[PDB]
Amino acid sequence: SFELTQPSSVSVSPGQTANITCSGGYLGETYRSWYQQKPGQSPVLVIYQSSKRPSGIPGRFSGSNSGNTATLTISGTQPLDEADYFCQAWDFTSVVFGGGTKLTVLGQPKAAPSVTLF
Amino acid sequence: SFELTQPSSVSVSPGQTANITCSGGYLGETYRSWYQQKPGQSPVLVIYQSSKRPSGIPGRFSGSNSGNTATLTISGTQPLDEADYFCQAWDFTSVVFGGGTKLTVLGQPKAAPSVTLF
Amino acid sequence: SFELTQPSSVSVSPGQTANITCSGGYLGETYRSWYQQKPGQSPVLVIYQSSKRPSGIPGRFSGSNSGNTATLTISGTQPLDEADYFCQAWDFTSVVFGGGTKLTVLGQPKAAPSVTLF
Amino acid sequence: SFELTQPSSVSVSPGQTANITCSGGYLGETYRSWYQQKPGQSPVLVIYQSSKRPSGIPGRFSGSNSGNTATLTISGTQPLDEADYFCQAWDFTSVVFGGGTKLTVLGQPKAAPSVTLF
Amino acid sequence: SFELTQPSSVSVSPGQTANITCSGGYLGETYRSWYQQKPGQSPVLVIYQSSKRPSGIPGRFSGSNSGNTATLTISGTQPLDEADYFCQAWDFTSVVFGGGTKLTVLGQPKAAPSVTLF
Ligand SMILES: *[C@@H]1O[C@H](CO)[C@@H](O)[C@H](O)[C@H]1NC(C)=O
Ligand SMILES: *[C@@H]1O[C@H](CO)[C@@H](O)[C@H](O)[C@H]1NC(C)=O
Ligand SMILES: *[C@@H]1O[C@H](CO)[C@@H](O)[C@H](O)[C@H]1NC(C)=O
Ligand SMILES: *[C@@H]1O[C@H](CO)[C@@H](O)[C@H](O)[C@H]1NC(C)=O
Ligand SMILES: *[C@@H]1O[C@H](CO)[C@@H](O)[C@H](O)[C@H]1NC(C)=O
> Cα B22–B14–E90 angle (5° rounding)?
30
8-state DSSP, A70: S
Q: Which of B16, B46, B97 sits opposite C46 (nearest CB)?
A: B46
Question: Residue A82 in contact with residue E82, Cβ under 8 Å?
Answer: yes
Cα distance between residue B1 and residue D3, in whole Å: 12
* SS3 of E7-63: CCEEEECCCCEEEEEEECCEEEEECCECCEECCCCCCEEEEEEEEECCCCCCCCCCC
Distance from CA of C106 to the nearest CA of B (A): 5
d(C-alpha A54, C-alpha A71), whole Å: 10
B98 reaches E (C-beta below 8 A):
yes
A19 lines ligand 1 (CB under 6 A): yes
First-to-final CA distance of chain D? 14
**Chain center to CA of B29:** 37
Q: How far is the CA of C19 from the centre of ligand 3 (A)?
A: 6
Instruction: Name the experimental technique.
Output: cryo-EM
Min Cα–Cα distance to chain E from A93, Å? 5
In angstroms, what CA-CA distances link B91 with A84, B53, C68, D90, E47? 19, 31, 17, 10, 27
C21 lines ligand 2 (CB under 6 A): no
- Give D100-116 as a 3 state SS string: CCEEEEECCCECCCCCE
Q: Chains meeting D at 3+ CB pairs closer than 8 A? A: B, C
**Which residues on A lie below 8 Å from E25 (Cβ)?**
25-26
Are B64 and E98 in contact by the 8 Å Cβ rule? The answer is: no
Contact D89, C90 (CB under 8 A): yes
Q: How far apart are CA D51 and CA C52, in angstroms?
A: 6
Whole-angstrom CA distances from D94 to A95, C20, C92, D90, E24 are: 15, 14, 8, 13, 32
E19 C-alpha vs ligand 5 centroid, how far in Å? 6
Ligand 3 binding residues, C-beta < 6 A: C 17, 19; D 19
B interface test, pick of D77, D93, D102, D106 with most B CB neighbours within 10 Å: D77
Torsion of CA A76, A78, A80, A85, to 10 degrees: 10
Around C104, how many Cα atoms within 13 Å sit in the side-chain half-sphere?
9
User: Using CA atoms, how far apart are residues A100 and C87, in angstroms rounded to an integer?
Assistant: 35
Are D58 and C59 in contact, with CB atoms under 8 Å apart? Answer: no
* Rounded Cα gap, residues A45 and B87, in angstroms: 26
Cα torsion B71, B75, B77, B80 to 10°: value is 150
Nearest CA in chain C to D14: C13
Chain E environment of A19 (Cβ under 8 Å): 18-20
Expressed in angstroms and rounded, the spacing between residue A84 Cα and the centre of ligand 1 is 29
List residues bridging with D20 in a β-sheet. C20
Burial (CB count <10 Å: 0-12, 13-18, 19+), residue B94 = buried
Determine the residue of C16, C17, C19, C23 to mutate for testing ligand 3's pocket, defined as the one with the most ligand atoms within 8 A of the Cβ atom: C19
Largest CA distance in chain E: 109
C67 touches chain A (CB under 8 A): yes
* A24 contacts E86 by C-beta, under 8 angstroms: yes
Chain B residues whose beta carbon lies within 8 Å of the beta carbon of residue D64 = 99
